Design an enzyme around this catalytic site. Sequence first.
Site, PDB file in Angstrom:
ATOM      1  N   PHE A   7       0.982  -1.109   0.009  1.00 17.23           N
ATOM      2  CA  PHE A   7      -0.127  -0.056  -0.037  1.00 17.23           C
ATOM      3  C   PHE A   7       0.905   1.256  -0.039  1.00 17.23           C
ATOM      4  O   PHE A   7       1.708   1.372   0.804  1.00 17.23           O
ATOM      5  CB  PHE A   7      -0.809   0.250   1.044  1.00 17.23           C
TER       6      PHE A   7
ATOM      7  N   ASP B 109      10.021  10.854   1.694  1.00 13.80           N
ATOM      8  CA  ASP B 109       9.425   9.775   2.259  1.00 13.80           C
ATOM      9  C   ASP B 109      10.265   8.514   2.009  1.00 13.80           C
ATOM     10  O   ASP B 109      10.021   7.290   1.922  1.00 13.80           O
ATOM     11  CB  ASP B 109       8.124   9.322   1.523  1.00 13.80           C
TER      12      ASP B 109
HETATM   13  O1  LIG Z   1       6.579  -4.338  -5.768  1.00 13.52           O
HETATM   14  C1  LIG Z   1       5.990  -3.365  -5.425  1.00 13.52           C
HETATM   15  C2  LIG Z   1       6.130  -2.336  -6.288  1.00 13.52           C
HETATM   16  C3  LIG Z   1       5.763  -2.450  -7.646  1.00 13.52           C
HETATM   17  O2  LIG Z   1       6.634  -3.386  -8.134  1.00 13.52           O
HETATM   18  C4  LIG Z   1       5.700  -1.183  -8.576  1.00 13.52           C
HETATM   19  C5  LIG Z   1       5.149  -0.208  -7.793  1.00 13.52           C
HETATM   20  C6  LIG Z   1       5.030  -0.099  -6.500  1.00 13.52           C
HETATM   21  O3  LIG Z   1       4.563   1.155  -5.828  1.00 13.52           O
HETATM   22  C7  LIG Z   1       5.272  -1.198  -5.743  1.00 13.52           C
HETATM   23  C8  LIG Z   1       5.081  -0.925  -4.253  1.00 13.52           C
HETATM   24  O4  LIG Z   1       4.695  -0.071  -3.695  1.00 13.52           O
HETATM   25  C9  LIG Z   1       5.463  -1.992  -3.405  1.00 13.52           C
HETATM   26  C10 LIG Z   1       5.456  -2.097  -2.101  1.00 13.52           C
HETATM   27  N1  LIG Z   1       4.736  -1.085  -1.479  1.00 13.52           N
HETATM   28  C11 LIG Z   1       5.698  -0.065  -0.720  1.00 13.52           C
HETATM   29  C12 LIG Z   1       4.761   0.797   0.286  1.00 13.52           C
HETATM   30  N2  LIG Z   1       5.645   1.626   0.774  1.00 13.52           N
HETATM   31  C13 LIG Z   1       5.820   1.738   2.247  1.00 13.52           C
HETATM   32  C14 LIG Z   1       4.890   2.601   2.931  1.00 13.52           C
HETATM   33  O5  LIG Z   1       4.877   4.100   2.986  1.00 13.52           O
HETATM   34  C15 LIG Z   1       5.487  -3.020  -1.276  1.00 13.52           C
HETATM   35  C16 LIG Z   1       6.105  -4.361  -1.782  1.00 13.52           C
HETATM   36  C17 LIG Z   1       6.271  -4.406  -3.238  1.00 13.52           C
HETATM   37  N3  LIG Z   1       7.008  -5.677  -3.705  1.00 13.52           N
HETATM   38  C18 LIG Z   1       7.789  -6.549  -3.111  1.00 13.52           C
HETATM   39  C19 LIG Z   1       6.725  -7.330  -2.631  1.00 13.52           C
HETATM   40  N4  LIG Z   1       7.750  -8.593  -1.969  1.00 13.52           N
HETATM   41  C20 LIG Z   1       7.415  -8.821  -0.435  1.00 13.52           C
HETATM   42  C21 LIG Z   1       6.409  -9.892  -0.455  1.00 13.52           C
HETATM   43  O6  LIG Z   1       5.315 -10.035  -1.124  1.00 13.52           O
HETATM   44  C22 LIG Z   1       6.099  -3.345  -3.992  1.00 13.52           C
END
Ligand SMILES: O=C1c2c(O)ccc(O)c2C(=O)c2c(NCCNCCO)ccc(NCCNCCO)c21
EC number: 2.7.11.1
Length: 263
Positions: A17, A136
Amino acid sequence: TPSHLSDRYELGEILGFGGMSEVHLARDLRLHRDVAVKVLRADLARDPSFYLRFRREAQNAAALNHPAIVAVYDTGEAETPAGPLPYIVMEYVDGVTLRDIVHTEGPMTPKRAIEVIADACQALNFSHQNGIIHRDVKPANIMISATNAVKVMDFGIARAIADGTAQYLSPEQARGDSVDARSDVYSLGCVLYEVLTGEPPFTGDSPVSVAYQHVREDPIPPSARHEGLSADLDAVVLKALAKNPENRYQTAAEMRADLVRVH
Ligand SMILES: O=C1c2c(O)ccc(O)c2C(=O)c2c(NCCNCCO)ccc(NCCNCCO)c21
C-alpha cells in the site's frame, strides 16, 4: 475492488500500500505485460484533497523518468459499481524491499550497501534536479529488482515546487517546517545506517519519542553498533545525519560522491 479496470488492466494480488491506497500486480491486456497499479481507496476518491493529491502524484511521478526510479506508464479513472476510482499504472518491479532484505538477511555487506545507496542517490538527485522532493525515503520504499536494479518508489507525498511510522524522518519534518533536498539526504542517511548495522539510528515506544531522538540525540556511530565498519564510512553516514541541514550534504550528488570515494 473490481477485477478488471477500464477493460484493459486485470488486477491481481496486492503488492503493497502506498499510504491509504492498494497497489496491485496486474496484467495490461493490450500490451501483454505485468504492470503494477495504484487505486485510490474509493471513499478516499470522493474527497477532493485526495483526488488532487493522487492526480498530482501520477503527474509528479510520470513527469520524471530514470532507471532507478519507478516509471509511470498511465493513469485513468475506472467507473465501477462502487463508483469512480482513479488509478496509476506503473512499471512493475519483481523484487523485494530494502526493508524485507534487511529483515531476512540481517545487515548487508558494506560493499553491497554502498553501491545500493549510491544508486539511490542518483535517483534522488535526478528527482531534485527535476524539482521533486520525495519526502519519504525509507527501506520500504527502495527496491532491488530480480535483475539486481535499484528502484526508488512511492512518490506518494513527493512535492514539486508547484505549491505513520517514526524513524526515517528528517528533523525539520519532525519540528514540522519546509523540507528540501537535504531532508531527503538525511532520510537516506537513516536508510544507509539501517542497512549497514541491521539497525535504525533511533527507536522508541511511539513516533513521538523517535521524533525527539531525531531532533536531540547524536546517533551512535555505526562502527559501535556493528564491527567491520570503516571509520571513513562512519563519518559519511554521520554527515548525512547532521542535525542541521547546513552541516549535511547539500545534495544527493555530494553524498554519492563521498560514498564512491570510500568504496
Ligand atoms: O513491488 C512493489 C511495487 C511495484 O512492483 C511497483 C510499484 C509499487 O508502488 C510497488 C510497491 O509499492 C510495493 C510495495 N509497497 C511499498 C509501500 N511503501 C511503504 C509505506 O510507506 C511493497 C512491496 C512491493 N513489492 C515487493 C513484494 N515482495 C514482498 C512480499 O510480497 C511493491
